[PDB]
Amino acid sequence: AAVRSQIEAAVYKWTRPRPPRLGVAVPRSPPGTGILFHTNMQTIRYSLSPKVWVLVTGAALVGVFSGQRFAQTVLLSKNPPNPPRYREKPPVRHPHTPD
Amino acid sequence: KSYYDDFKDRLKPGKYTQGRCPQSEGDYRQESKTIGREHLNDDGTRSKRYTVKEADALGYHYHPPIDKKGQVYVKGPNTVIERGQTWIKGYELPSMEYTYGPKQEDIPFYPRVKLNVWGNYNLVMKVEFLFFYLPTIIVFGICIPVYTINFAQEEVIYTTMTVKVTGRQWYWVYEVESPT
Amino acid sequence: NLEDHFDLAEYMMKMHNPMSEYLYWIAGFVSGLHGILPLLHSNYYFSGMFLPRDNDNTQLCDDSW
Amino acid sequence: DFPWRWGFVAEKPFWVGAPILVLGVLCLGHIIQTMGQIGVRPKRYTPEWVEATKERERAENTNPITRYLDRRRAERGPYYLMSNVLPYHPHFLWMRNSHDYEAAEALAARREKDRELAAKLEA
Amino acid sequence: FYILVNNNKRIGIYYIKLSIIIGILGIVLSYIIRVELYNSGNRIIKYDNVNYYNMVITLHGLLMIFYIIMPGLYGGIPLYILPILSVITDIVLPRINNISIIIVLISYIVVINSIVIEYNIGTGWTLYPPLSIIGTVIVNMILYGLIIIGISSIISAINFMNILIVIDGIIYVYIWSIIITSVLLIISLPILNGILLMILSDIYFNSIYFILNGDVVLYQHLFWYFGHPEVYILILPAFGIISIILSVLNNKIIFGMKSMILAIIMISILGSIVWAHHIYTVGLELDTKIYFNNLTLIISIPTGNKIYNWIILYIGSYNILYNGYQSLIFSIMFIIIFIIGGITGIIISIDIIDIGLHDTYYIVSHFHYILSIGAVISLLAGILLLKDIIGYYNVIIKINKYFGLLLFININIIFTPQFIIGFNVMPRRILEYSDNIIVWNLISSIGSISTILILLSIF
Amino acid sequence: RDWLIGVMLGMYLGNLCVQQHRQYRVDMKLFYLEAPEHKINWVKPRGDL
Amino acid sequence: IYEGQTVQESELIPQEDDWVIEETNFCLGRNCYVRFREEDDLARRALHQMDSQLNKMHTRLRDGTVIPYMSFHPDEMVDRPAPIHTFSEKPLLKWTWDETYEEAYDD
Amino acid sequence: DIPWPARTDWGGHDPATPFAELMINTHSMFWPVAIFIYVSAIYMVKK
Amino acid sequence: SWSVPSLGIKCDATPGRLVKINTFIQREGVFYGQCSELCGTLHAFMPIVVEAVSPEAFAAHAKKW
Amino acid sequence: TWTEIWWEHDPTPKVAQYRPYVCTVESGKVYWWCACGESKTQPWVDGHCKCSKREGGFRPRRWEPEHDGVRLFCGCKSCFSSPTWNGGCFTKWMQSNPAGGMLYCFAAAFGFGTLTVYRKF
Amino acid sequence: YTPSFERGLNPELTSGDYGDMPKPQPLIDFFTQNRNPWFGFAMFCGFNFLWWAFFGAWQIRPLWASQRKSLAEADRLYGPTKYGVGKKYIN
Ligand SMILES: CCCCCCCCCCCCCCCCCC(=O)OC[C@H](COP(=O)([O-])OCC(O)COP(=O)([O-])OC[C@@H](COC(=O)CCCCCCCCCCCCCCCCC)OC(=O)CCCCCCCCCCCCCCCCC)OC(=O)CCCCCCCCCCCCCCCCC
Ligand SMILES: CCCCCCCCCCCCCCCCCC(=O)OC[C@H](COP(=O)([O-])OCC(O)COP(=O)([O-])OC[C@@H](COC(=O)CCCCCCCCCCCCCCCCC)OC(=O)CCCCCCCCCCCCCCCCC)OC(=O)CCCCCCCCCCCCCCCCC
Ligand code: HEA
Ligand code: HEA
Ligand code: CUA
Ligand SMILES: [O-][O-]
Ligand SMILES: [Cu+2]
Ligand SMILES: [K+]
Ligand SMILES: [Mg+2]
Ligand SMILES: [Zn+2]
Ligand SMILES: [Zn+2]
């Protein structure tokens, strides 16, 4: 549990997002400007920060392929060698051959 | 609350199927005799005489609307002079309760918001490039396989036997070389 | 005129005679019959029955009915 | 503003009605398509004809790569075939006791002749 | 008046009305087909009346293509909104617009009358010779209907092209969709007329083009030189509708408008040069096959760009707006369904795959997913969007989640199994089949009866 | 960025069919070589009825 | 690509410290099928329909200007249902440019 | 050889010629690409 | 159209064209097919049955039939 | 992260719970949802939180069910489909505890991988 | 069915007076829709279709039992030889 909190606090500190490098030409907000809008505005989707998104998405990818390996090695089985192919007698006549 | 109960009174349930009495009880096909309603039937629908038999577009009841001075009647605006200025008061439509019925209260709030636009020109341009060239790559990935399999069907092979197959209505004839 | 403002004013103002709707549905019904009636007629013409009995063109068991 | 049928349906939760309606419509369709074939018993679905086809498949070694690939897949993991569990024809509801006795006698006679030919071939 | 009206909006209503009427006959024929195919045996058609089945499939195809979907998506919605989108008072050619709808009705009456009076035989909707030219008079009547329909299509195309001369606003994507379909008609129809005249010459004028020393494969070239442009003349108006619905309902400006427009232009040019993918099994030269296979796969590029531009239109839209409207659901369903149809089209485009899948029910399911599902739903979605403007009522469709769900589920029950039987394999244009294909055929048949029942609930 | 999740989900599901195809080809190579289902000098002509 | 109108920081500076974003409802109201009175005849039901047009509605802001019902396409600008003759006065598509001529001004 | 009941046979079945094997494998080769094209596009059909 | 799905053959039997199709059967058996071009009333009733036998068996068959 | 790093002029809620609230709702009744996360009658406004007092840009969120039933409601106060829940509560939790988020995502992906591989194989 | 009152992760945020407003409940209620029998029938209905969609109805099995025992005997006695697990399948 001590190690759990340690790694949890280590991940958290590293992932805290930095301000975005805006790829758009917007003004600077006037200084001292607080909340102007309200919560009845059309909801804006809550998006993970890039670092966090990579971490969880990477955990998902490592998870699905490790799950694929677990199924392949434990749940599934390999083909045993094919049965020996011995000479066998074919039927004497085709069932539809006129007599 | 139930908004239907607010305008229940206006909606009186009907008596006749399809809202008309039998033609015998009242002849709705005839033109109304009421003054000023010569273009309407008794039930209120437009009469065939007005719309078909004597349609004005066909030259019946010729009456040019425009006057000598090239003018037609036009209704003016509601003008209200005030504060040393002539103002026009616009016509506001009646309350939607009058026209639709529901009482205009407890309306959900939909705020003003400017159009939802995609930003970051550079990012958008790259996506559009991918929207076009990712399919192009896939097509190119199929192109080589397509050529090979086509070449395979049309390969000059050292065939040693021939079977001729003719299709007729409705059976298949087969011609084969007979052993010597 | 106000009555002429809207195309198909009687229908849009919900005063039209219901017979117009009935004719439209009847016309569609007649159109459908052009696929069923010739089927029955052609079946009888070449077989003597208006419709077949399922699998009556194949060998059937003695107790088949 | 709506007739009784829609007022009734639209009152219920969508995911209560929708699933029931989906099954109901499908069941009705099958019922409609079964009314014209009540008691129809084609001879080719009898046990005698079913056995004769198996004999033909053995002689012709039919679909050998489907049989090999099924065995390989089943050995590796969970393999489920619809053909194994479900009927292949719709007349199964009426053909529980149906038989073609003429085919039974002919098939038995041919099998007896085949046994004689096999012994002769063995020599 | 009723028949004399020249109003472009009234004529648009007439086109939709007539498409539904003629559509009843189309659906009935489809029910006959699926009923017959429910098991092996004869079910509703006698073995001595097998010619009727051949006629049923032929008329089904012809009516649904030329008398239902084309009059509905290229005649109905276009004649009602195009002059409004162009901020013009009315259509450029009023009298021509009137005669076009009358022509369609008259050609329909000729076709159905030929069912009743003539001997019932069929040669497919593709009227391949020599089979088409050794038939009875019903084939002659069908040819007259097609030629008459061709007159209406070309004059309507001329009508829409004239909007460029009068348009007072901006050419929106939808307007571009109709204009390009009109161009495709002006260039493809004259070739069709020529080959149809040659079919008539052999039927009625003792010509010898389709007898030995004359190449029957010639017909297939000229027919399909119109055939495939036809499938895009039927889909492009649907694409135009989808663009309007998604932008309007999501309150989002079309993204990549110029790429949408240039994608439509590209599809048309490419669609005019890929026709021989319908003739892969005839025995064409290796290089020809490779050319056509290569160019056929290219069409996916412009078609793919449009699909992804639609997706981003729906992405990001406000959550507060109710998304259960039937028009929005149908528009979204079109993207989901069209991708299935197109991908299977790319599969069949590979000629070697096509050898196995030509003249099999895989082809059926492919073009049904695009037309019977995609095009129909697009026309429904477009009409639904214009319900207030058109003004029709007495139906429960606008907000009916049951109808959309049941339609989607059951339509897939019909045609998804037809992809499976394509690899079993079950040929097309047949009524009897081996007993080991009953399961899938039965499932699809159960789907057909169910879809019809759902059409009654709208009223 | 989300569209990438779809690419990865479509790459995982596609890879499942790649593995099935891979095993299919291995099985096919062993049919004519070892499979007892493969029989030769077995089918005899039926003859005209 | 369009990314909204450009804003200068000077234009984002309030004239009072209490200014917030105006909370005006842009939901026009509660509606349903247009409900005609039985007493009204064909002419008076036409007037009723013309008075129930959503595209004639607007929202008035705090300064007296009104934001109208707007649409991407002119299909939503005609009366619903569409009348026989719609655009008698040609709809005007307003384009903007920076060109000017002296005659328009006075000193 | 012959159709069998309730069989998907996705891409073909029971080849008996080298060309027949080619056809089956061509379909199998493209099938995962088709799944990718579908899944990748459908996942983004949402608000 | 001569179609044998197991042999990977689907060639259109068109009047005026004698199309060449090359094949190499690898296993014995009986491969069933059907006409794959609507050819008239009985398009569904002209199947294609090909039986592949050992070369020694084929020679004996050809010599007798 | 729109309120956290991109835009500083929208009200920022407090997370009441990183799990949805399950409630039975009735058609024809209007419900008011807390958008600040400080109400003591979650998921509803209690008359004493920021939303009730219209303070700091917080307002109650109107909601009305079409049919009767049990519906999930947002506790994180940031779900895209708020007041209803769509999974944003878990997403917002991962932003706040990225190490935990990875554990759950790996486990979910592991199960999905095993089942899909086991059935297809 | 008189559902229970689930306080949640933060019990202090559910400690107020709800009055008429509904109280939070356990998640089992959401899955059972408050143990609505019709939703349970609908749930069972959903499984029934999905089973038909993927594997077939499997409701015909009791009726097909005798005709699946005849098919199995024919395949074993007269059909082409099956090897190993292949013997489990009959077509
Ligand atoms: C135990 C043993 C083993 C131990 C193992 C141990 C392993 C340890 C691993 C540790 C790893 C640590 C990683 C840390 C995170 C690094 C990444 C990150 O988040 O940035 C860090 C850092 C984040 O800092 P922060 O603190 O979060 O600050 C955030 C700030 O607010 C502002 O920051 P900013 O303004 O600087 O901008 C940053 C932001 C800017 O973001 C953006 O602008 C958006 C980026 C995403 C755009 C995606 C567009 C996709 C369009 C698709 C269109 C077509 C669709 C249809 C296709 C149909 C096909 C049929 O970046 C992101 O959001 C990046 C998100 C993640 C991108 C992932 C791309 C994966 C591609 C995978 C391809 C796979 C191919 C497989 C082929 C297989 C073949 C068989 O970023 C920076 O500061 C900038 C520099 C770093 C940039 C990194 C590279 C980005 C690349 C984007 C590529 C997009 C896809 C392109 C191809 C598309 C093909 C279709
Ligand atoms: C695909 C299906 C499902 C679709 C589902 C999705 C749908 C989504 C929504 C789509 C919406 C599309 C847009 C809609 C716009 C509507 C606009 C509108 O209302 O315009 C106003 C327009 C006219 O209204 P108006 O302005 O008041 O017009 C006044 C008149 O102009 C003047 O009034 P008048 O009273 O003076 O009128 C003259 C009247 C005078 O009428 C009378 O005097 C009638 C007397 C009673 C006759 C009743 C029939 C008798 C039949 C006897 C049969 C006997 C058989 C015996 C057999 C014996 C066997 C042994 O008629 C005539 O004289 C001529 C009538 C010609 C038409 C009828 C033809 C019937 C078939 C004939 C077949 C002949 C075959 C011969 C073969 C020969 C072979 C040798 O409305 C209509 O025409 C009705 C439209 C109704 C439906 C509208 C759409 C509703 C939504 C869709 C519902 C579902 C429909 C599904 C299709 C149908 C299924 C069956
Ligand atoms: C409107 C109807 C319509 C539409 C749009 C199409 C579209 C396409 N069709 Fe068509 N087709 C028909 C209707 C249609 N078809 C009909 C009716 C027939 C049979 C006529 C008869 O024989 O009687 C037919 C027959 C037909 C055949 C004949 C098969 C045979 O005869 O055996 C072929 C093969 O080339 C084909 C191919 C295509 C292709 C390659 C497309 C392309 O347009 C598909 C493009 C779309 C996509 C590819 C999906 C969307 C794009 C993406 C998702 C981008 C990513 C994808 C890739 C990179 C591949 N079609
Ligand atoms: C766009 C044209 C179209 C449409 C809608 C359909 C719809 C349907 N088709 Fe289609 N069909 C074809 C065009 C179409 N078909 C063609 C061109 C062929 C090949 C012809 C040939 O082989 O020669 C064909 C072949 C064909 C066959 C092959 C028969 C054969 O040749 O062996 C079968 C049955 O399996 C079939 C079934 C169906 C079914 C069950 C429906 C539908 O019933 C499915 C259910 C959907 C609905 C019932 C809704 C339809 C509603 C409308 C169309 C009206 C829309 C109007 C408005 C919205 C105003 N069709
Ligand atoms: Cu011969 Cu079909
Ligand atoms: O036809 O594609
Ligand atoms: Cu084509
Ligand atoms: K049959
Ligand atoms: Mg063919
Ligand atoms: Zn609050
Ligand atoms: Zn939440």
Side-chain angles (χ1 to χ4, degrees), chain D residues 43-54:
Chain D
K43 294 217 296 178
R44 62 189 182 274
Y45 302 112
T46 60
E48 275 64 54
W49 287 57
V50 165
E51 294 177 9
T53 59
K54 298 299 185 178

Side-chain angles (χ1 to χ4, degrees), chain E residues 416-434:
Chain E
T416 303
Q418 294 180 6
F419 285 122
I420 296 169
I421 61 175
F423 300 101
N424 288 4
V425 176
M426 204 207 152
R428 300 172 42 175
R429 306 187 168 179
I430 53 168
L431 75 177
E432 296 282 359
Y433 56 84
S434 57

Side-chain angles (χ1 to χ4, degrees), chain A residues 46-70:
Chain A
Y46 194 93
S47 180
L48 301 166
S49 70
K51 262 183 199 172
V52 174
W53 181 92
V54 168
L55 287 164
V56 301
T57 295
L61 297 161
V62 170
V64 75
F65 290 115
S66 68
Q68 171 169 98
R69 278 287 154 65
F70 170 83

Side-chain angles (χ1 to χ4, degrees), chain E residues 47 50-51 54 123-124 128 131 212 215 217 281-282 284 355-360 427-432, chain I residues 1 3 5 8-17 19 34-45:
Chain E
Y47 170 68
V50 171
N51 313 47
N54 295 358
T123 65
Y128 274 19
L131 187 67
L212 257 183
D215 201 345
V217 183
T281 62
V282 158
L284 309 176
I355 301 158
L357 284 181
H358 178 72
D359 294 312
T360 74
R428 300 172 42 175
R429 306 187 168 179
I430 53 168
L431 75 177
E432 296 282 359
Chain I
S1 180
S3 175
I9 295 165
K10 189 174 293 177
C11 177
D12 265 20
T14 310
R17 299 204 169 190
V19 177
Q34 308 178 197
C35 184
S36 299
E37 191 84 67
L38 182 58
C39 55
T41 299
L42 302 179
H43 151 54
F45 305 82

